[PDB]
Symmetry: C2
Subunit: 324 residues, 2 copies
Amino acid sequence: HMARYDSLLQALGNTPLVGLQRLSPRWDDGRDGPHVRLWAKLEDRNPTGSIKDRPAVRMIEQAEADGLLRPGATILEPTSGNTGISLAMAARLKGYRLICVMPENTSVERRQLLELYGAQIIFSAAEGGSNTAVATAKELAATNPSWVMLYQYGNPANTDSHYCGTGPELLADLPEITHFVAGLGTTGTLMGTGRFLREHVANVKIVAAEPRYGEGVYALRNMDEGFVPELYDPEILTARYSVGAVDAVRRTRELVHTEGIFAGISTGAVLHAALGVGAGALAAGERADIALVVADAGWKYLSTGAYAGSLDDAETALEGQLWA
Amino acid sequence: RYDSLLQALGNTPLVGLQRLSPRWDDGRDGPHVRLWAKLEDRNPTGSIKDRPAVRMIEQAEADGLLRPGATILEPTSGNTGISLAMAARLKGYRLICVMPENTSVERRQLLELYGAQIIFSAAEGGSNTAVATAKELAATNPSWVMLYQYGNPANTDSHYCGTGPELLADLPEITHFVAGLGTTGTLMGTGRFLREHVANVKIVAAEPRYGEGVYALRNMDEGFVPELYDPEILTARYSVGAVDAVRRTRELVHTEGIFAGISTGAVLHAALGVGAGALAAGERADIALVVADAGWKYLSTGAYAGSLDDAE
């Protein structure tokens, strides 16, 4: 036995870390100085194809250990994007009923996909900005004590899945890590992976990549202004890079072209930040081993037209598109 | 842990389907009849075709057919094209895919994203004029090499040396192996390996019903019989309709949370038929089946929702 599992939930994490020899500023050290290396952590190697499998499973089993989820409970979650798929898969495999509260703009194709997983989907209506999914789910949950809202936006088990998973896994394959670059959505990946790495690597850099394009996890929400995510700790990040549509898209196209990795649209932001951090490593003469997260694959996004034709069409195509 | 995407190939998960299995748990009603899903969507481009693609290039290199400036030519519109694009690129070859004018526009962009040049064969000459045009094209100069997945023993060898050993390692109690019949590489290579090392193992082909295409699968009456195909290897063959393939594919998501492509439904239908028969016979079964790819490329086809009749 090398990879025999009794359930799909066991085939989670322990994802590949793949060196990018072509796309890296300099893979081999030499005459002009130390190497600047990019390493890609392939989180699409997960049950549903995204990094959200980790926190989804960890939230349920924390809720079990905490005694909130008992055998016949229904999980109620305000959601969008990859978390919808991950929670649907995880709830089912764990024997729970799931209701997803989703913003009224969710596609019918995506509704039907989650319903095939067994989730009941409730659309909140929202005559305002993007939606009211959270407050609706919170009210529904208040209706029945065996109805439990996990709330990924503020659930510590979100960041714990990366402190206990993504982080230790990174440090095991990349003891020489100098930088960690990931997308900033709920902040779980950054806060959890980052706290772990900072406790073990003396001045590792934790770099937030922040897409300026599409829609993120908080899109389904009405937020207070210039908000702070509930999971966010202000002393973990050492840097943030804000990344535009055109830059994101050509980085994603380059990754496929030169490394054969077909990544999701959030990885464009991550790659751009990473390459900019890398270009700094010797403008400064310094060595770099930069781990970067590929949080999902392109399959889900190629319908968009974001990988085809002109970068103008691609940029236009990213409008209104969930990247998380 | 990998210096290259190509190292992250094979060694795929085998996952027990506790809910969808006829009988997961041995009881006093009789022995277990278990389904185990071999997840080949966990390969670099998301399909089982990364295996033969990588091995066919490797073999061609060994045979002295491929030197630095070579272009590989292959007739393919499907998963082999994608696999060979990724693999050719990382190995530093050029790839031309030959597909008919009638092929989609979505694939074009997919294949060209992975770095592939596309030449269009005459429309209304099927995937056969496509093969003949590719042969003709490759004959125009020695720098152009056609691998030819339907006759290339490296396709089979990839499964003999990869898929088979992995299955045996993870599922030593295996009684049945079930896979779709397309090039036949998967069944032939893994079947031959398992039959060498597992005394009474049964190798079961899932084929499409005549005229009812199931993506990636071939019916050998209707189509050309791949040169790779050895009749003696198979102990059984099930023909699977579209409706059955589609409803098994949906049922795999619903019961097991695995989002697979439609060949996996066909394979599931054959496997459930085998399992049903074992259940009724009172005989234990551990049935390994191939999940060849994921459902993403099929979902716009409307066959994960709506009526089964509308699944086209």
